[PDB]
C-alpha cells in the first residue's frame, strides 16, 4: 500500500494528495521496483541519458554537442490508428455513426471492453523497472490557456523526450498544487524477467499495443509502444484528443496547426495558423526562410495550436509544446535551413542513419559526405546509396534553439491569429491559393480537405484532424460554426493552399520552399482589406498580376490557377458522398448548405 520505501527521488509526502493517489494506486497496480519523481533538472537529464547509454538503449553522436541516437524495434516505429481508441458511454459522442461503411473519423471502445483490455495488460507490467513520475505543463507555465499533466512511465526514453517536448519538472508540481490534471499512464509492457526477446534494446509489446483516451475520466492510458505519438502522451493524446473535447466543452479550439508570425517591409506583423495533413510540410512553412526582401518569418510552433477568443474578440493562439518532434527524412539546408541549425545541439534522434564520424544521415539530406565517411543505417547495418533512415524517423529538439523562434512564443496571453490556412497534396485541379467566401464556407473548406498519400490514393483528412478528433466530427463542425455567433469574435480569414500542383508531365508548377512567402504576402494583403482578389466558384484567387512573381521568371499562372468545371463537378460530388456517409445525421445544416452552393456555382460555369 505505502510505496514510500521505493521512491528514489522526490517524496510521496511532498506531492499533492490527488497526485499521490494517482502515483501510488498505479504503483500498486503496475508494481514498479522504484519510483522516480522527475525534477526536470539538467543533472537528472544528463544522468538518465548516460544510463540509457550504459544499457545500449541509446548511442551518443560524437560529432555534435550533446546529441543522441535511438534505434528501435522495427515493429514499433509509428502511431497505430487501428489500436488508438476513445472511450465514452455512447459511441455517437466519439464518432459519427456512418451511413454505409466503417468510420474513418475515429475509433470507439466501450468502457467494458477497455476495462478487460486494461486488466489483461497493466497488472504487474512494470516489475523490476523504475516508474518515472513526470509532472508537465502544456503551454507557457503562467498561461491561463496552459494545462497540466502527470505522466507515469517506465521508459527513460519517454522521460528525456518529454523534457524536450513539454515543460517538465518540479516547478510544474509547485504550480499545479491541488488543481486538476490529466492523468497519463504509459508502460512499454515488458515486465522483468522478460517473457519475450528484446529487439535492438527497445522494449515494446506490439501484440498488446493500445493507446486509450477516457475524456470523461480525464485519463490517457497507453500500453506497449515507446514511439513518440504513442508514448509522449502530452502531444497527440492530450493536446489534440483530450483537449479538443475540453475545447468543445469550454468554447475554445485545439487544432493540428502550426503557428507562425510574419512581418512585412513596413514593420507590421501578423500571426497565421495552418493545418496540413501528417504527410508533412508544416515544419517547413513554420520555419520558412522567406525569399522576398524585407519580409520576416518567425516560428511559434509546428504542430499543435490551442486557440481561444479573448474579451476583445481576438483569436489568441499558444503552442502547447516545448519542442519540435519533426520528421527527419527530407530535411535539408535547402528545404529547412532553420531546422538544421536547431538540431545540432541537445537533440535526440530516433531511427536515422549514423555516419562513421558520429553524424546523422537520412534520405533527402542533400549533404555530400567526404570520401572516407561510411554510413550505418537505422537497422544497424553498413549502408550504401533500402533506405538508410526509417521514413517516419525523427528529431526531438528544443523550440528555444530555433534561430527564428518568435519572441512571443511563450507569452502567456498567446498571439492573435488573423488568418487560417488549410491545404493538401493535390496533383490536379486545385489552385495554388484561394480564399474562402465567408466563415461558413471556410469551415466547409476545412471539412473538404483531401490529400494524396505517399497507384496513388487521395484520402480525406478534414482539418488535418482525421487521426486526432477527440469527439464526434459533426459536433466538431458545429463547434467551429458556433464561433460566428460569439459576442465580439473577430473571425480570421480562411485560406486554402496547394503546393503540389503538377503540369501534364508530372512536374510541380510552383517552386515552393521560401517562394511560398509570395503567397503569404497575398494573404497578408487580403487581411488588410486589399482589392487583390478575383471571385471564382471555389472562392477568391489572386487577380491578374496580384502576386509578386519577380525573380522567378515565367511561372505558368493560368494552369496554376486553372479551375475546370469537369474536375470540380467530380470534386463536389465526391465530397458530398463522403460527408453524407461519414458525418451522416451529424452533418450541420450550414455545411450541407455550402456544399449545395458550391455545386450551384460550378453548374453555372
Ligand atoms: O505522431 C506523429 O507521427 C506525429 C509526430 C509529430 C508531429 N506530427 C505527427 C503527426 O502525425 O501529425
Ligand atoms: Mn502532427
Ligand atoms: Mn450560423
Ligand atoms: Na536500440
Curated annotation (Swiss-Prot):
Substrate binds at residues 79, 227-229, 278, 392-394. Phosphoenolpyruvate carboxykinase activity is regulated by acetylation and glucose levels. The anaplerotic conversion of phosphoenolpyruvate to oxaloacetate is improved by PCK1 acetylation on Lys-83 (K91ac), Lys-456 (K473ac) and Lys-504 (K521ac). High glucose concentrations favor PCK1 anaplerotic activity by triggering acetylation on Lys-83 (K91ac). At low glucose levels, SIRT1-mediated deacetylation of Lys-83 promotes the cataplerotic conversion of oxaloacetate to phosphoenolpyruvate. Phosphoenolpyruvate carboxykinase activity is inhibited by 3-mercaptopicolinate. Induction: Regulated by cAMP, dexamethasone, glucagon and by insulin. Dexamthasone, glucagon and cAMP increase levels, insulin decreases levels. GO terms for molecular function: carboxylic acid binding; GDP binding; GTP binding; magnesium ion binding; manganese ion binding; nucleoside diphosphate kinase activity; phosphoenolpyruvate carboxykinase (GTP) activity; phosphoenolpyruvate carboxykinase activity. Its EC number is 4.1.1.32, 2.7.11.-. Acetylated. Lysine acetylation by p300/EP300 is increased on high glucose conditions and promotes ubiquitination by UBR5; acetylation is enhanced in the presence of BAG6. Deacetylated by SIRT2. Deacetylation of Lys-83 is carried out by SIRT1 and depends on PCK1 phosphorylation levels. Phosphorylated in a GSK3B-mediated pathway; phosphorylation affects the efficiency of SIRT1-mediated deacetylation, and regulates PCK1 ubiquitination and degradation. Phosphorylation at Ser-82 by AKT1 reduces the binding affinity to oxaloacetate and promotes the protein kinase activity: phosphorylated PCK1 translocates to the endoplasmic reticulum, where it phosphorylates INSIG1 and INSIG2. It catalyses: oxaloacetate + GTP = phosphoenolpyruvate + GDP + CO2; L-seryl-[protein] + GTP = O-phospho-L-seryl-[protein] + GDP + H(+). The modification Phosphothreonine is found at residue 170. The active site is at residue 280. GO terms for biological process: cellular hyperosmotic response; cellular hyperosmotic salinity response; cellular hypotonic response; cellular hypotonic salinity response; cellular response to cAMP; cellular response to dexamethasone stimulus; cellular response to fructose stimulus; cellular response to glucagon stimulus. Residues 446-470 are annotated as: Omega-loop. Pathway: Carbohydrate biosynthesis; gluconeogenesis. The modification N6-acetyllysine is found at residues 62-63, 83, 456, 504, 507, 577. Its cofactor is Mn(2+). Coiled coil: none annotated. Keywords: Acetylation, Cytoplasm, Decarboxylase, Endoplasmic reticulum, Gluconeogenesis, GTP-binding, Kinase, Lyase, Manganese, Metal-binding, Nucleotide-binding, Phosphoprotein, Transferase, Ubl conjugation. Signal peptide: none annotated. NCBIfam families: PRK04210.1. Cytosolic phosphoenolpyruvate carboxykinase that catalyzes the reversible decarboxylation and phosphorylation of oxaloacetate (OAA) and acts as the rate-limiting enzyme in gluconeogenesis. Regulates cataplerosis and anaplerosis, the processes that control the levels of metabolic intermediates in the citric acid cycle. At low glucose levels, it catalyzes the cataplerotic conversion of oxaloacetate to phosphoenolpyruvate (PEP), the rate-limiting step in the metabolic pathway that produces glucose from lactate and other precursors derived from the citric acid cycle. PANTHER family: PHOSPHOENOLPYRUVATE CARBOXYKINASE (PTHR11561), PHOSPHOENOLPYRUVATE CARBOXYKINASE, CYTOSOLIC [GTP] (PTHR11561:SF18). Monomer. This is Phosphoenolpyruvate carboxykinase, cytosolic [GTP]. The gene is Pck1.
Amino acid at each position: 500500500l505505502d510505496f514510500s520505501a521505493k521512491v528514489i527521488q522526490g517524496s510521496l509526502d511532498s506531492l499533492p494528495q490527488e497526485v499521490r493517489k494517482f502515483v501510488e494506486g498505479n504503483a500498486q497496480l503496475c508494481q514498479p521496483e522504484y519510483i522516480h519523481i522527475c525534477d526536470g533538472s539538467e543533472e537528472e537529464y544528463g544522468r538518465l541519458l548516460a544510463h540509457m547509454q550504459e544499457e545500449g538503449v541509446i548511442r551518443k553522436l560524437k560529432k555534435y554537442d550533446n546529441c543522441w541516437l535511438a534505434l528501435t524495434d522495427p515493429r514499433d516505429v509509428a502511431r497505430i490508428e487501428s489500436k488508438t481508441v476513445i472511450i465514452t458511454q455512447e459511441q455517437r459522442d466519439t464518432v459519427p455513426i456512418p451511413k454505409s461503411g466503417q468510420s474513418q473519423l475515429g475509433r470507439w471502445m466501450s468502457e467494458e471492453d477497455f476495462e478487460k483490455a486494461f486488466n489483461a495488460r497493466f497488472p504487474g507490467c512494470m516489475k523490476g523497472r523504475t516508474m518515472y513520475v513526470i509532472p508537465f505543463s502544456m503551454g507557457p507555465l503562467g498561461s491561463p490557456l496552459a494545462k497540466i499533466g502527470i505522466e507515469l512511465t517506465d521508459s527513460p526514453y519517454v522521460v528525456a523526450s518529454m523534457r524536450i517536448m513539454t515543460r517538465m519538472g518540479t516547478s510544474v508540481l509547485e504550480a499545479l498544487g491541488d488543481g486538476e490534471f490529466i492523468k497519463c499512464l504509459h508502460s512499454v509492457g515488458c515486465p522483468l524477467p522478460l517473457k519475450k526477446p528484446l529487439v535492438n534494446n527497445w522494449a515494446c509489446n506490439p501484440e498488446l499495443t493500445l493507446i486509450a483516451h477516457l475524456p470523461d475520466r480525464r485519463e490517457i492510458i497507453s500500453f506497449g509502444s515507446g514511439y513518440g505519438g504513442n508514448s509522449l502522451l502530452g502531444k497527440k493524446c492530450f493536446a489534440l484528443r483530450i483537449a479538443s473535447r475540453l475545447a468543445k466543452e469550454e468554447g475554445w479550439l485545439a487544432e493540428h496547426m502550426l503557428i507562425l508570425g510574419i512581418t512585412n517591409p513596413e514593420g507590421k506583423k501578423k500571426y497565421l495558423a495552418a493545418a496540413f495533413p501528417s504527410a508533412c510540410g508544416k515544419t517547413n512553412l513554420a520555419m520558412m526562410n522567406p525569399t522576398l526582401p524585407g519580409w520576416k518569418v518567425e516560428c511559434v510552433g509546428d504542430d499543435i495550436a490551442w486557440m481561444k477568443f479573448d474579451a476583445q474578440g481576438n483569436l489568441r493562439a499558444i503552442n502547447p509544446e516545448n519542442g519540435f518532434f519533426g520528421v527527419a527524412p527530407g530535411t535539408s539546408v535547402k528545404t529547412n535551413p532553420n531546422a538544421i541549425k536547431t538540431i545540432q545541439k541537445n537533440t535526440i534522434f530516433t531511427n536515422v542513419a549514423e555516419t562513421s564520424d558520429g553524424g546523422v544521415y537520412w534520405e533527402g539530406i542533400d549533404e555530400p559526405l567526404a570520401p572516407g565517411v561510411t554510413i550505418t543505417s537505422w537497422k544497424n547495418k553498413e549502408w550504401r546509396p533500402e533506405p538508410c533512415a526509417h521514413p517516419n524517423s525523427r528529431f526531438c529538439t528544443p523550440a528555444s534553439q530555433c534561430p527564428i523562434i518568435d519572441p512571443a512564443w511563450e507569452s502567456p496571453e498567446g498571439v492573435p491569429i488573423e488568418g487560417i490556412i488549410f491545404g493538401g497534396r493535390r496533383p490536379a485541379g486545385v489552385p495554388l491559393v484561394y480564399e474562402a467566401l465567408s466563415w461558413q464556407h471556410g469551415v466547409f473548406v476545412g471539412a473538404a480537405m483531401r490529400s494524396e498519400a505517399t497507384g496513388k490514393v487521395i484520402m480525406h483528412d478534414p482539418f488535418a484532424m482525421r487521426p486526432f478528433f477527440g469527439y464526434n466530427f459533426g459536433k466538431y463542425l458545429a463547434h467551429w460554426l458556433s464561433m460566428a455567433h460569439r459576442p465580439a469574435a473577430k473571425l480570421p480569414k480562411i485560406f486554402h493552399v496547394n503546393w503540389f500542383r503538377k503540369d501534364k508531365n508530372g512536374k510541380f508548377l510552383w517552386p515552393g520552399f521560401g517562394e511560398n512567402s509570395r503567397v503569404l504576402e497575398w494573404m497578408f494583403g487580403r487581411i488588410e482589406g486589399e482589392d487583390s482578389a478575383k471571385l471564382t466558384p471555389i472562392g477568391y484567387v489572386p487577380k491578374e498580376d496580384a502576386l509578386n512573381l519577380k525573380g522567378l521568371g515565367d511561372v505558368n499562372v493560368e494552369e496554376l490557377f486553372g479551375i475546370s468545371k469537369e474536375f470540380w463537378e467530380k470534386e463536389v460530388e465526391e465530397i458530398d458522398k463522403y460527408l453524407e456517409d461519414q458525418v451522416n445525421a451529424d452533418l450541420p445544416y450550414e455545411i450541407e448548405r455550402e456544399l449545395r452552393a458550391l455545386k450551384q456555382r460550378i453548374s453555372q460555369m
